[PDB]
Amino acid sequence: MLKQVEIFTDGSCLGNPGPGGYGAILRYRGREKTFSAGYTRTTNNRMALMAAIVALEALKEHCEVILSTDSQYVRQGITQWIHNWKARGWKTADKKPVKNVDLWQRLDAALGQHQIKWEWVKGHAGHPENERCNELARAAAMNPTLEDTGYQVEV
Ligand SMILES: [Mn+2]
């Protein structure tokens, strides 16, 4: 009846923009899979989206996902803009390209693959997993090996 999985995520960036990284943990009945990658020039918002995107796309079957993130930006996108974006060809109020459309569309595609249960956490603090994701994100940010291809300007 759909395996239940828990995903923890964290995006971290040394600047705005600047080197950044994402950290994600996927827990299933005890065991977990780690995901991390560093980029030379990106933003915290994009890394936060990427963390979720990567964890979700790694699932090979429909699952019930409890997705935890401390990103206020992802929370706002998910809870207040995603709906209208799709129902509008991904354009703002006065018909204009939405910021980070490349990652939001990719996330939306992965979210539609599962039964999602978002968990809006307030920072790492007392969440072992998210704290762990932050560590991985920072570590990747300090040793970036990829370019955030979908990032240009508009900041
Ligand atoms: Mn964080």
UniProtKB/Swiss-Prot annotation:
Its EC number(s): 3.1.26.4
Cited InterPro entries: RNase_H, RNaseH-like_sf, RNaseH_domain, RNaseH_sf, RNaseHI
GO molecular function: endonuclease activity; magnesium ion binding; nucleic acid binding; RNA-DNA hybrid ribonuclease activity
Coiled coil feature spans: none
Major location (coarse): cytoplasm
Keywords: Cytoplasm, Endonuclease, Hydrolase, Magnesium, Metal-binding, Nuclease
Catalytic reaction(s) noted: Endonucleolytic cleavage to 5'-phosphomonoester
Effect caused by changing residue 70 to N: Loss of activity
Localization, UniProt: Cytoplasm
Residues annotated as domain RNase H type-1: 1-142
Ligand binding (Mg(2+) 2): 10, 134
Binding site for Mg(2+) 1: 10, 48, 70
Effect of deleting the gene: In a strain that encodes a retron, the msDNA is abnormally sized.
Record annotation: effect of changing residue 10 to N: Loss of activity
Family indicated by similarity: Belongs to the RNase H family.
Name recorded for this polypeptide: Ribonuclease HI
Biological classification of the source: Bacteria, Pseudomonadati, Pseudomonadota, Gammaproteobacteria, Enterobacterales
Gene it is expressed from: rnhA
